[PDB]
Amino acid sequence: AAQGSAGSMLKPQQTTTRDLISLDGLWKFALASTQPWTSQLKTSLECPVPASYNDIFADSKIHDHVGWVYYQRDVIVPKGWSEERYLVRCEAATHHGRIYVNGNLVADHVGGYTPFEADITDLVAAGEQFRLTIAVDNELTYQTIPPGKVEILEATGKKVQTYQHDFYNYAGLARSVWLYSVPQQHIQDITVRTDVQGTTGLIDYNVVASTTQGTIQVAVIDEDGTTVATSSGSNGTIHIPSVHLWQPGAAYLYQLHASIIDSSKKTIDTYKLATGIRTVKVQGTQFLINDKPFYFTGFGKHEDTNIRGKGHDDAYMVHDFQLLHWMGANSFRTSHYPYAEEVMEYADRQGIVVIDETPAVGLAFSIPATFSPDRINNKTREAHAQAIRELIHRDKNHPSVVMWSIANEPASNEDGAREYFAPLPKLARQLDPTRPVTFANVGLATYKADRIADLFDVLCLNRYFGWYTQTAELDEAEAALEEELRGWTEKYDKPIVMTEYGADTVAGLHSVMVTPWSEEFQVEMLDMYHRVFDRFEAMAGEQVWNFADFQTAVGVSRVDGNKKGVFTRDRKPKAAAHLLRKRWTNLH
Amino acid sequence: GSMLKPQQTTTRDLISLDGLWKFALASDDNNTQPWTSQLKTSLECPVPASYNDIFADSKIHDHVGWVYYQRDVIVPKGWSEERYLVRCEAATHHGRIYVNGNLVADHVGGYTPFEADITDLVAAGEQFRLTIAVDNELTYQTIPPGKVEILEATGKKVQTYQHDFYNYAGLARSVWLYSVPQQHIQDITVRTDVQGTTGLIDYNVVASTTQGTIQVAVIDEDGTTVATSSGSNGTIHIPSVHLWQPGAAYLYQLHASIIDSSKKTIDTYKLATGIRTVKVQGTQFLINDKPFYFTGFGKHEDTNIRGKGHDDAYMVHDFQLLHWMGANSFRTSHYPYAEEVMEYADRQGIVVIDETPAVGLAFSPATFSPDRINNKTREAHAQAIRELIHRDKNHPSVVMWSIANEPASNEDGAREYFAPLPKLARQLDPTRPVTFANVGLATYKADRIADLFDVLCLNRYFGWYTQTAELDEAEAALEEELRGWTEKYDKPIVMTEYGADTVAGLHSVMVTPWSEEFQVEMLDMYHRVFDRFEAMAGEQVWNFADFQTAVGVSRVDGNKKGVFTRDRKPKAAAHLLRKRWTNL
């Protein structure tokens, strides 16, 4: 883990040449008390892996814990492995993960939403058994990339985790853990850039191999199963005659088979990696996927379900996606962190557009000046960029991912904000020149007051007039909102997307009168917002906040988390769901 | 036709096949044999789950008949010289495994494993297309029984059945590819006895071939081996044993290895056992020779979207909620649950009543005849006992088998039907008492099955059905029945189920059903009566949590008799229970 760079490999898969093993299951679990990774574990406490631990146990001490926790289990390297290089991966640690093989530290990793792994091949032998213990610290600071500070309670002395975001600070191994193998000479990375000449579809590729052994073949197969182009070399471009384009309601995916042939006509490594072929351009006030203009519809979302909290779930993913299709949503935004990788591949097959967001949420203090040597400084920017790299490295390939979101609701109206943010969108366009760049702008940072927006390609606005400013005054709110829309459309020649608009709603709370927290009120606000968007020709999309009720930090104005959900936390449609379905399916 | 739960050792390997499978349901195309081609679906269905609620699509949820799960599988290169097979922890009722178009297994239990040795069908290091066909149709001969019918006007197929809960279908439990040595261990058996302070156990391993020798280590929780033995089976004493107790789980690990001509280990298996005895004497249920009282619930394999699908987190949380409220037991309501739950219960010190999938042997027409439930049905019923007991025999947590829930034990034919069944059970496993859960109509007068069973499991719901909202009246009808049974039979009585429906948030200070308060009052008044009867052996409230059911004008989006909500939140009764169960 180095400054200015990203060292993950490709998403482990199984092949004729590589082997894959799941470490998911229950693991022994305990709380920081000393040096637990040097002996076995002493607990009847077992925690499921793909999951956040906080809610799992029905224990207050555990849920409330500030610091490190310890997952542990034994592992056996299959005896079939020697002559194969093998290693241990975490798709994500809560925030700060550490990997111990038997009681030597083998990896330390600061991102909370991106993979990390350790090559253990010289460290254990094929056929041998070791003690995998993984340490996850949930502590946020001013330098950690969702920012925060631990404090202490004057009377009881209890440790307490402050932060500036909405959603609860769920910790642990939220994403699958793996033990896999790769041949000594292997493909480590692949870069795919899809473009279109007339009707001919060309993808520039780039394959990275552990050594300089043999050569690099690439077959490119269609959905039916018949290869449609081939190539040699670590890099080039591939021509596809009469391409089936990946379309935002009509996913087409070709399968790029990268192989590492040895001296002779023999395959020694291979890797299957799906791409779809699509361009993304912003021209002025317009968002083009495949040179036709596009309008987002959908939600910012969360990784949040009932007991597992943030832990990725196969069936909620599929269900969630069906609800999107049910209502004719075409996109969503990975809200305030990168989601599980498997959600991105699913999004690709599913033909859903994604706004991929770094875990930079709450870069402000006004939910004290936020950009200084105290709160958000240069060491913080360093971590912010560190996170931009790992996200892009990981996600660069998904045709569904369509624009990077640098941050949520940063204090972009304050002195200091511009210096801070300047290198970040520039980093993004550099590492990946194919997609546009944005961040979701807060209400305070008005068109006048914001000093960041010009550095970005698309304008993403979060607004809540009918909620905060004009509380229940929908007409006075329609005033405020078009005031603001005008301001942006006049000052800038970018396209605009409402990334956040909504109102807390308690399922079953009804009222014939104007009343916030009533299914009815939610409808009305949503509806008048829509009416306003349609009168602005500069709008390029709309994302309700949020998909579904979700858990947040304890708070008096938070009714057991955030209820701005259009669906309940158990995924049941409020009235708003049906409004959105009616608008999204019945017009363009 | 099963084998020990696959596990990774030094000599066995093991891959999970869980994840997104291409999913499609059977239509009446030209394509009558979908298992020999790529599926036309662009639907991916998650595996550990069950499919009905997953797709937000009616036709899918409503479907009667076959569906197909399909995916590609790579047998590892290193697997050769080794023996490998594909296991299904469970299907919906009827599962068929196809390996490259080839029918390789066909299995009729709904909640137990089935598997296929495919070592000669696919080459190690090669890829194959695995497709699994699961049929959800019940009949008079399936183990939950029921008939399929046709809606007169529209023509739509519909599935009738007799039991409460919804008929969630699919691959509700994990799928595996796994390696095993040519000369492998196939089954193990453990029987734990207590002889004063010393624990004894009789191991019985069954390997594939008879060369080399069988060796056994028994390691304590601290890593130190504590008795050793040689031979395909023998009996072990453990000096000052650490007993598995309902309050305090303790699990010795039994390593059974298959030594060869030399001093090398060709195969090996790790099998957890707890040392504990179950005796029923008189009206008493004794665990390790002290009186025991079941506290807890009938439960269900039911969560929100995955339906019946096994779930690690809800598992762990559920148990944490038993601990929270001082529960000590539960009943695998109306089907054996997933294997790993039973394992977990072992580690957790939670006692289990293991029930077969046999509910709804009741048509309230005459239910026991050559039409509804005949010998053929009874064949299948004995098969489930075989497969249930074969799989679960080893668990210190499992403490009783439950033959069936709420059968018409009061009708003619009932007796001829059940007779062979508990005999079968006691023959397959002498170490545990046998029961079934008695329905309300089958009173202590009317019932004609009960004498044939070790423990009496009942599920009275007077305050609900009978003296609906008349608790004083229900109290009487309740104690009347308990006099009856305790007067008539010299056995332990456990209220297997009991309690009233309740809507979270619905409240009242008076006697009003469907209010949180009414539930507390019913549950309570029952406990008052249980405490007066010396023959009582345990109480299990009817239900851990709300669960989905067959659609009904009397079922508010499922059953709400649950003590927690479907997303597992405490109702008023949860607290009443916690108070009683922790404190005395």
Side-chain angles (χ1 to χ4, degrees):
Chain A
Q3 205 160 332
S5 195
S8 297
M9 265 189 193
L10 286 179
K11 210 196 153 198
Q13 77 189 35
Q14 189 152 62
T15 349
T16 57
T17 70
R18 317 191 169 175
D19 265 1
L20 197 26
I21 274 139
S22 179
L23 292 185
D24 298 347
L26 307 195
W27 296 41
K28 308 201 209 190
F29 178 97
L31 290 174
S33 231
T34 160
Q35 282 209 347
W37 58 83
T38 58
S39 49
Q40 282 269 294
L41 207 38
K42 217 167 328 207
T43 31
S44 332
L45 271 196
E46 288 171 277
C47 182
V49 209
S52 283
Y53 62 82
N54 307 254
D55 277 358
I56 260 144
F57 284 106
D59 192 307
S60 246
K61 195 204 203 169
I62 300 181
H63 172 255
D64 296 347
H65 173 76
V66 170
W68 283 97
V69 301
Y70 300 110
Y71 296 88
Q72 195 176 81
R73 67 164 266 151
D74 287 315
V75 185
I76 297 174
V77 189
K79 88 225 151 188
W81 262 205
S82 64
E83 248 102 325
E84 228 82 29
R85 184 149 284 274
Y86 44 92
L87 63 179
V88 166
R89 173 186 265 225
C90 293
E91 293 194 24
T94 194
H95 288 311
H96 182 14
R98 278 187 192 143
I99 324 207
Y100 300 92
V101 173
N102 261 328
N104 315 270
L105 178 61
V106 195
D108 172 286
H109 170 265
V110 196
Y113 297 96
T114 45
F116 58 99
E117 54 187 348
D119 184 316
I120 64 166
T121 88
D122 301 312
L123 236 293
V124 171
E128 200 200 309
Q129 158 165 149
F130 64 110
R131 178 168 34 70
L132 212 214
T133 149
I134 303 178
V136 195
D137 167 66
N138 63 29
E139 171 165 1
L140 306 166
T141 76
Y142 291 132
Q143 275 70 40
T144 62
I145 221 261
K149 178 187 252 146
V150 164
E151 255 139 23
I152 282 161
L153 265 36
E154 260 213 354
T156 71
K158 187 196 215 208
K159 276 187 256 77
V160 122
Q161 181 62 263
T162 70
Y163 42 104
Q164 357 286 131
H165 57 280
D166 234 338
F167 53 95
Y168 186 59
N169 188 45
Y170 280 121
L173 300 167
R175 299 209 183 110
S176 295
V177 172
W178 298 103
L179 190 253
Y180 74 119
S181 104
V182 90
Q184 222 80 211
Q185 154 73 140
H186 54 262
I187 307 167
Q188 330 186 103
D189 186 62
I190 299 185
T191 295
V192 175
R193 280 152 198 212
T194 74
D195 207 312
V196 177
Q197 173 105 72
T199 81
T200 357
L202 34 127
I203 93 211
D204 308 22
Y205 69 98
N206 201 305
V207 185
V208 181
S210 57
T211 68
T212 55
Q213 255 249 282
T215 60
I216 285 159
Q217 278 321 289
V218 165
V220 163
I221 308 187
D222 63 30
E223 282 197 357
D224 307 328
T226 63
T227 86
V228 83
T230 53
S231 234
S232 312
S234 89
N235 77 74
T237 98
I238 312 201
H239 290 65
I240 305 154
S242 290
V243 238
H244 295 135
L245 311 156
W246 191 103
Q247 289 277 65
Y252 198 103
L253 297 185
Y254 294 83
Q255 223 75 208
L256 179 326
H257 283 257
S259 345
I260 276 183
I261 317 317
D262 81 34
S263 101
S264 32
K265 256 148 207 222
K266 183 237 232 322
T267 101
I268 184 176
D269 190 33
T270 198
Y271 189 96
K272 207 196 194 172
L273 160 265
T275 4
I277 293 165
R278 49 105 258 251
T279 79
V280 180
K281 280 146 202 153
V282 191
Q283 261 145 46
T285 152
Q286 273 216 308
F287 199 103
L288 321 164
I289 293 158
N290 303 324
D291 293 83
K292 60 220 272 179
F294 176 77
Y295 194 79
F296 290 92
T297 61
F299 316 82
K301 273 172 68 62
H302 266 292
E303 292 201 304
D304 169 284
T305 60
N306 194 49
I307 292 176
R308 45 189 79 260
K310 283 221 125 64
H312 161 89
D313 171 314
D314 256 353
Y316 273 67
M317 190 189 71
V318 186
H319 190 75
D320 279 355
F321 276 67
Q322 309 311 288
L323 294 177
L324 297 176
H325 302 307
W326 168 83
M327 51 186 337
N330 62 215
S331 63
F332 67 96
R333 167 168 118 270
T334 78
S335 286
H336 318 338
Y337 47 84
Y339 292 5
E341 332 189 58
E342 186 194 335
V343 172
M344 312 281 71
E345 307 165 344
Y346 189 58
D348 290 329
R349 298 165 234 151
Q350 283 306 325
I352 298 307
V353 162
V354 177
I355 290 175
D356 218 334
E357 193 178 308
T358 81
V361 248
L363 271 198
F365 271 78
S366 13
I367 215 91
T370 107
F371 294 110
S372 21
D374 31 0
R375 318 291 194 229
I376 282 62
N377 49 43
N378 323 84
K379 224 326 195 206
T380 303
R381 178 168 66 201
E382 214 47 50
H384 194 331
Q386 203 33 245
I388 301 182
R389 299 183 171 281
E390 318 209 358
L391 195 154
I392 304 201
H393 178 228
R394 190 249 247 174
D395 282 6
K396 57 187 177 200
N397 289 348
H398 302 288
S400 48
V401 183
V402 127
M403 160 163 70
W404 310 105
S405 168
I406 300 318
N408 202 253
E409 293 175 358
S412 45
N413 59 309
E414 307 200 355
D415 305 337
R418 196 175 181 84
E419 276 170 81
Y420 177 78
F421 267 98
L424 308 177
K426 297 212 137 146
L427 215 213
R429 308 215 197 57
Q430 170 232 120
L431 289 150
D432 168 56
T434 93
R435 312 173 161 89
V437 199
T438 197
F439 74 105
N441 160 107
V442 71
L444 270 189
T446 54
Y447 65 87
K448 291 209 194 75
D450 188 281
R451 61 184 58 127
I452 263 54
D454 59 281
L455 312 172
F456 294 89
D457 303 323
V458 179
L459 305 178
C460 286
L461 313 186
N462 309 347
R463 264 2 171 235
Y464 295 97
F465 297 108
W467 197 245
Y468 294 113
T469 22
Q470 307 44 46
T471 310
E473 303 286 1
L474 283 177
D475 281 342
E476 183 68 43
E478 198 181 16
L481 176 73
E482 59 177 343
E483 150 96 58
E484 177 86 24
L485 252 20
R486 251 180 280 285
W488 292 94
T489 60
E490 232 101 348
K491 176 163 250 129
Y492 292 114
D493 174 40
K494 340 217 97 130
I496 311 157
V497 173
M498 276 289 317
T499 37
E500 283 188 18
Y501 63 119
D504 290 76
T505 0
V506 151
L509 198 158
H510 292 267
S511 176
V512 266
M513 308 280 315
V514 148
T515 54
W517 294 90
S518 93
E519 280 194 41
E520 275 80 32
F521 182 80
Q522 191 188 36
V523 170
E524 287 154 351
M525 168 171 176
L526 261 41
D527 196 45
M528 89 79 166
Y529 264 63
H530 298 155
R531 272 166 28 210
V532 166
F533 301 165
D534 296 13
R535 294 192 326 246
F536 294 84
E537 159 235 325
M539 291 296 309
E542 61 196 33
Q543 309 206 316
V544 196
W545 182 251
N546 179 25
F547 181 66
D549 304 344
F550 65 91
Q551 192 48 236
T552 64
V554 104
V556 301
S557 35
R558 291 286 177 244
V559 172
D560 196 30
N562 180 132
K563 304 271 126 120
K564 290 166 163 81
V566 149
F567 290 86
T568 47
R569 206 195 209 208
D570 56 328
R571 270 53 176 168
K572 276 72 213 275
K574 309 175 179 172
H578 308 283
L579 210 213
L580 293 163
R581 180 176 201 239
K582 222 198 76 126
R583 152 174 256 244
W584 295 334
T585 67
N586 269 303
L587 289 179
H588 341 299
Chain B
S2 268
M3 254 206 264
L4 291 145
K5 207 179 146 341
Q7 76 187 208
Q8 195 189 11
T9 16
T10 83
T11 59
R12 302 191 181 175
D13 287 313
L14 175 59
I15 304 177
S16 176
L17 300 178
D18 301 345
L20 306 188
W21 295 50
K22 301 282 281 172
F23 174 86
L25 41 71
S27 69
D28 62 344
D29 293 335
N30 80 314
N31 188 349
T32 81
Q33 292 179 250
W35 52 85
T36 62
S37 68
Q38 213 174 330
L39 286 173
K40 269 305 283 208
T41 266
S42 53
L43 309 168
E44 293 168 277
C45 179
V47 148
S50 88
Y51 63 77
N52 311 269
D53 279 358
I54 260 140
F55 284 103
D57 172 303
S58 285
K59 326 225 196 147
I60 307 203
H61 166 265
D62 301 346
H63 180 78
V64 167
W66 293 100
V67 313
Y68 308 94
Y69 294 85
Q70 182 173 94
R71 78 180 250 118
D72 287 292
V73 182
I74 284 192
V75 187
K77 202 214 156 169
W79 262 217
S80 64
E81 292 159 52
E82 217 87 11
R83 198 164 253 305
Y84 48 81
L85 51 185
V86 163
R87 166 193 276 226
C88 278
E89 292 206 22
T92 253
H93 320 296
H94 195 21
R96 288 177 180 156
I97 296 179
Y98 293 100
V99 174
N100 280 340
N102 280 350
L103 189 288
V104 203
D106 170 304
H107 164 279
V108 200
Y111 299 90
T112 50
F114 49 117
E115 62 188 26
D117 195 306
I118 50 147
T119 77
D120 305 319
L121 223 311
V122 205
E126 289 206 359
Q127 197 222 61
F128 73 91
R129 221 216 280 124
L130 200 199
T131 155
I132 304 187
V134 178
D135 167 75
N136 70 36
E137 175 179 3
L138 314 166
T139 50
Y140 286 158
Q141 286 88 45
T142 59
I143 213 42
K147 214 191 164 206
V148 162
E149 265 148 43
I150 305 179
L151 296 186
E152 141 125 45
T154 50
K156 173 190 272 205
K157 283 201 199 82
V158 135
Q159 174 87 241
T160 75
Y161 45 106
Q162 331 312 127
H163 52 283
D164 209 345
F165 61 96
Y166 185 59
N167 189 55
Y168 278 131
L171 290 164
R173 292 173 197 166
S174 297
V175 191
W176 307 86
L177 171 64
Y178 75 107
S179 117
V180 102
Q182 228 61 232
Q183 199 194 358
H184 59 281
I185 293 174
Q186 311 174 138
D187 185 61
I188 289 161
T189 291
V190 167
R191 308 183 157 174
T192 40
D193 197 89
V194 190
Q195 197 138 92
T197 81
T198 340
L200 64 122
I201 113 183
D202 313 353
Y203 68 98
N204 206 308
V205 196
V206 185
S208 83
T209 107
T210 58
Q211 347 145 225
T213 77
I214 277 129
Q215 312 274 45
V216 163
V218 173
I219 312 174
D220 72 3
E221 275 187 1
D222 291 322
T224 78
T225 71
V226 78
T228 47
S229 218
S230 325
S232 63
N233 69 90
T235 68
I236 298 169
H237 284 84
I238 300 164
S240 300
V241 54
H242 279 117
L243 296 176
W244 191 106
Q245 292 284 82
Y250 194 101
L251 295 172
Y252 288 98
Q253 229 75 207
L254 190 136
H255 297 261
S257 326
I258 288 179
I259 302 299
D260 73 359
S261 36
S262 172
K263 263 164 173 288
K264 166 174 290 182
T265 88
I266 165 133
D267 192 26
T268 177
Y269 197 100
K270 201 194 214 228
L271 184 258
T273 66
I275 300 176
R276 151 239 79 173
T277 58
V278 197
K279 288 157 210 153
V280 158
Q281 275 136 39
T283 66
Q284 256 164 13
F285 200 98
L286 317 142
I287 282 164
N288 298 316
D289 301 293
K290 32 219 258 165
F292 175 68
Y293 203 87
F294 289 73
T295 62
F297 303 86
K299 275 175 66 63
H300 255 306
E301 297 217 290
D302 169 294
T303 48
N304 193 60
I305 272 155
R306 44 199 58 261
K308 294 218 95 69
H310 180 76
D311 178 320
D312 268 338
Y314 284 83
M315 186 187 61
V316 173
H317 193 90
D318 282 355
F319 280 74
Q320 294 323 290
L321 285 174
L322 311 158
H323 291 320
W324 176 80
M325 70 197 320
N328 70 205
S329 61
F330 74 88
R331 157 151 135 289
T332 64
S333 292
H334 324 338
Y335 40 85
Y337 300 168
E339 315 210 59
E340 177 185 5
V341 182
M342 306 288 66
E343 294 191 337
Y344 189 67
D346 292 336
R347 295 170 237 154
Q348 280 300 330
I350 296 292
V351 161
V352 170
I353 298 155
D354 227 316
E355 187 172 303
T356 79
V359 247
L361 295 142
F363 293 86
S364 34
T367 96
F368 290 112
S369 60
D371 274 350
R372 315 293 228 228
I373 280 63
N374 42 45
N375 311 90
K376 271 298 291 127
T377 293
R378 194 178 59 167
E379 219 46 70
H381 201 326
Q383 196 63 273
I385 304 163
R386 276 173 202 296
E387 284 173 45
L388 191 159
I389 299 179
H390 178 238
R391 180 248 251 189
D392 286 335
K393 61 182 146 195
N394 283 343
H395 295 275
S397 62
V398 177
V399 150
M400 185 158 62
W401 316 103
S402 164
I403 305 306
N405 190 246
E406 304 189 322
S409 43
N410 68 299
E411 280 176 26
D412 290 324
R415 198 158 171 107
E416 297 94 295
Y417 179 82
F418 274 92
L421 299 200
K423 302 226 139 153
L424 214 215
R426 280 164 197 109
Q427 167 200 133
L428 304 170
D429 173 35
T431 86
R432 289 172 182 82
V434 168
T435 191
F436 78 102
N438 166 85
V439 92
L441 296 224
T443 54
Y444 60 85
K445 298 219 209 61
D447 181 80
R448 43 178 67 110
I449 245 46
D451 68 291
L452 306 187
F453 293 93
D454 307 311
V455 169
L456 298 174
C457 282
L458 328 159
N459 333 327
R460 275 342 159 224
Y461 295 93
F462 301 108
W464 197 236
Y465 296 124
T466 23
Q467 307 38 56
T468 302
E470 294 292 347
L471 280 160
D472 268 353
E473 185 68 25
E475 177 148 359
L478 183 65
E479 41 186 343
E480 143 100 79
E481 186 87 33
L482 264 15
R483 265 183 280 278
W485 287 99
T486 73
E487 215 116 329
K488 162 163 252 134
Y489 287 103
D490 187 51
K491 15 207 69 171
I493 302 154
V494 174
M495 268 315 291
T496 6
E497 62 187 76
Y498 80 100
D501 281 64
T502 26
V503 161
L506 202 165
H507 277 283
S508 188
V509 275
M510 333 228 343
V511 188
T512 67
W514 289 94
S515 62
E516 284 188 41
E517 280 84 24
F518 179 73
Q519 186 188 34
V520 163
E521 273 163 36
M522 167 169 183
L523 256 37
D524 203 33
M525 90 79 159
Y526 269 62
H527 310 150
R528 252 163 40 222
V529 176
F530 294 172
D531 285 0
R532 293 200 306 258
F533 288 71
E534 167 232 337
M536 288 306 274
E539 45 201 54
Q540 289 179 346
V541 175
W542 186 245
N543 213 358
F544 176 65
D546 305 317
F547 63 97
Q548 186 58 215
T549 61
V551 75
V553 300
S554 57
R555 297 295 166 198
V556 171
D557 188 42
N559 199 112
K560 305 262 127 128
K561 261 170 205 87
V563 152
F564 296 90
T565 51
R566 205 200 203 186
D567 55 341
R568 264 72 177 158
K569 271 84 210 295
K571 299 178 182 152
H575 303 281
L576 175 90
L577 287 178
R578 187 200 184 185
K579 185 172 204 224
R580 148 181 253 246
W581 285 339
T582 40
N583 269 322
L584 286 135

